RNA sequence: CGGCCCCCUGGACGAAGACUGACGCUCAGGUGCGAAAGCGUGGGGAGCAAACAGGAUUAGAUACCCUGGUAGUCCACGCCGUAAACGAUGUCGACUUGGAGGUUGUGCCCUUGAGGCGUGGCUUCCGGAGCUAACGCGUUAAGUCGACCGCCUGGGGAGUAC
């Protein structure tokens, strides 16, 4: 679906510097221009397409997708992507054992929900100023952490990831439980934990956005189906 | 560290210059080193140990730096 | 940033006193290869040259001596 | 010094399997070639290809099923230090028949089962599983 | 070490082709000459142990070569040992 | 296919290493960080201070194109050296243009000599030149109306280390660093030098054709010890510095900044 | 349907400012009497709790083992840390000839007939692990055929 | 093994070619080299310094500290044959992901510049798979193998007695 030219324009073909590479990414690498590794778009594209297809399929059976990206450059974008296809996301720091330790995190989620309710639906007001402030702070904290996953209910049936090396904890968790992983994997990253590897530039913003958008579209399509 | 006071130069300035020169020479340090006999082994050990320390400072710390403190 | 690599000299000359004088201290000492940035191979040669000069009283062993 | 070429070859093969190498090249020898052929027949490698005139290079092409390697184990048995010769009744069964034992007999190098069928034993080269 | 000219001369004499140089016999001759040369040195310098190691090694090599020659071709070996005056 | 191989050598052909090809489009602005994309592996974290012109406020919105620089790749994550140096090459080209007709004409206005040559400033940048260059004769711009308008006629340039002394008024008129290290020597010759890296004891301003200066921590200001040089000056900025000391032997020119 | 055997329970200590804090480790193993086996190692201040924890652990992260009838498919070695273990398939009637922790794992796995020696260390936790490894690695005839690009009759 | 110079001299590495044609690897006994101290004979003796002497310190101080100070350290020729003689890791060969250096060659390239792209030798650090009781080792293995040798079999008694 996503063309090669577009990818090139975005800056998918660019990778990291040669000294920071992983030799498990040697198949997906093409060459090294100006001492910086170039990802092979001929090998990338089909894989990407396959991944997209898989995602679509998942969506079709009413699968829950989780969008992970805690880089802070593409935190805004990932959330947007998630919301477009009304799916869940973790745009700020992944809580260690979010999925493996769901049952504890489910309590946190509940608490957050309660807080939200108190804030909005109650309309009681009349609260001690320090206490109120504290409550507000707590709410903020919760929202930041678990805003995207509050309506997830259980565990997701697939896990889309913007960087494998950065979100290794998440990936690891997904492997322990057996959730399918769809990781964007730059040359420095490790592809071994990832099920459906996508060789591409995690760092560049435009590229990331592109990666998101197609995925979102596919999810939407699946839903429609 | 031979020095000559320039025409219309302050005393203090001259002194400072002299001190600087001395520092550059590493004369005091040298003297300190030759106060007592260092066994060859000891000398070796210090040199290697120092080198190791330097290496540690350079690389490990750099690695640490990549990650933010707060 | 070595001089001798750029010049492309085959061997450093003890007679070439001026050149040597750039690599010797105000106190007479030979200057480290960290500071000058001389290449290792050349540095040794330079040192040797300096030593030779000192033997021939072309360069001084030290500032104080007389 | 190089003392056991077959052993070396085996080792190379093992390393290839470990490291997920597609093909493994080495200096060719007749015995080695025979061994390779046997392996191919028994289905532990994809294909072997000798190439060269003066100093020819045997190139095996290793096999991988469902990610992992095919040659699970591969040991020399006879070795220059200590030779092993078996009579047709004393011929082994590698992995209770699931693996193979390359055995050099008077009628050429063959798998243990083949040797048994023939009705002859010999020098036991290697177990492969 | 052995001077170039001397080496060349040695090669020419013992070597069949004179371009050959690597002939066993030639090699032996070369070794032998070197050994002879070093004898003088070592008479003078008895404590030069490091140098003597090299000499020893050379001698060993020569011996090995001789042995090799013997098994291969006896007559040639005999001739060689007549020429050089090697007791064995 | 070989579509991609050919596309790779094509994209090699349509970029170069320095800040030469004005290619990065400014794709997000936020104070205090600009960011472009010149067809590199990542986006630059640009300062705002490489892009405000001569009075302090920004000049370029979204889509605008300046080249940056290169030859340094990956400090962890990111891509460039700053585009402002880019600009230096353009300045060099204009200075070079003189050679063609033996006269580069702009405006040069030089009020005074930090180190023996009036300072001339062209557009945003200000440069320092040797003392003769400011005036054609012995006219001296001290009697001229302050920060006067002429041009610059070049008197002297040092060709390696970048010091250019230029000719105000009089329109009618028309190994290597260390042997002869006596030019900026004599006691206090002021220099204009860009700082490079501040090593918590130092600042490392070093400009004059392959040398190293320190301005370590003791002067820097008029407080001694509590100063921490990163707070007090900058990173990458051309400043007031002069020599105070040269050892041509243990190459330590020890500059100062309290002057 | 699942059978679960607590192999060992061991008291372990942690020294603190006051004195010694004691705790209990429970090593259990569970299986369905067919291929599926899983050991669990649980820890708690009281024994029963620890045991429960171990059981819970066991029940998740199980592992499948190809069993030719009541016995193994071929002799198999398994190692882990000190404990190196040999186990050999055996004729119907012979029973589980194996010692200690090793026996328990076998029993749950639904091997009925084995000849099994534990060389090296016999530290229950390690030895059970070793046994598990051995079981896991053990390939079937069908599997081998699949691997090699042959039929089952070609392999025999 | 360390100032500089000369004379005699051993090894290593690279570059191409040319030649020899398995001549190789390992090695019980055997032979040699083997820090420091130590011994013998003859020289030498500045500094340093076992022993020794005095002064302190101390409950004592046959030590640490101070002031002196002789063997010895230095040279010649002999002997001794041991050291945490350590990488606590036998030698030789083959094979198995990477990164950052150092040093010393060498091929090409507009050396347009201190550079660019390789290719050899030796070497420091980090780390992957794998290995390991763990610590760690990790293409210079403690990984995967082969050849030969050396050595271990609870602590003490004892590397002692005869």
UniProtKB/TrEMBL annotation, chain A:
<dbReference type="InterPro" id="IPR018130">
    <property type="entry name" value="Ribosomal_uS2_CS"/>
</dbReference>
<keyword id="KW-0689">Ribosomal protein</keyword>
<dbReference type="GO" id="GO:0003735">
    <property type="term" value="F:structural constituent of ribosome"/>
</dbReference>
<dbReference type="Pfam" id="PF00318">
    <property type="entry name" value="Ribosomal_S2"/>
</dbReference>
<dbReference type="InterPro" id="IPR023591">
    <property type="entry name" value="Ribosomal_uS2_flav_dom_sf"/>
</dbReference>
<dbReference type="InterPro" id="IPR005706">
    <property type="entry name" value="Ribosomal_uS2_bac/mit/plastid"/>
</dbReference>
<dbReference type="InterPro" id="IPR001865">
    <property type="entry name" value="Ribosomal_uS2"/>
</dbReference>
<dbReference type="GO" id="GO:0022627">
    <property type="term" value="C:cytosolic small ribosomal subunit"/>
</dbReference>
<keyword id="KW-0687">Ribonucleoprotein</keyword>
<dbReference type="GO" id="GO:0006412">
    <property type="term" value="P:translation"/>
</dbReference>
<comment type="similarity">
    <text>Belongs to the universal ribosomal protein uS2 family.</text>
</comment>
<protein>
    <recommendedName>
        <fullName>Small ribosomal subunit protein uS2</fullName>
    </recommendedName>
</protein>
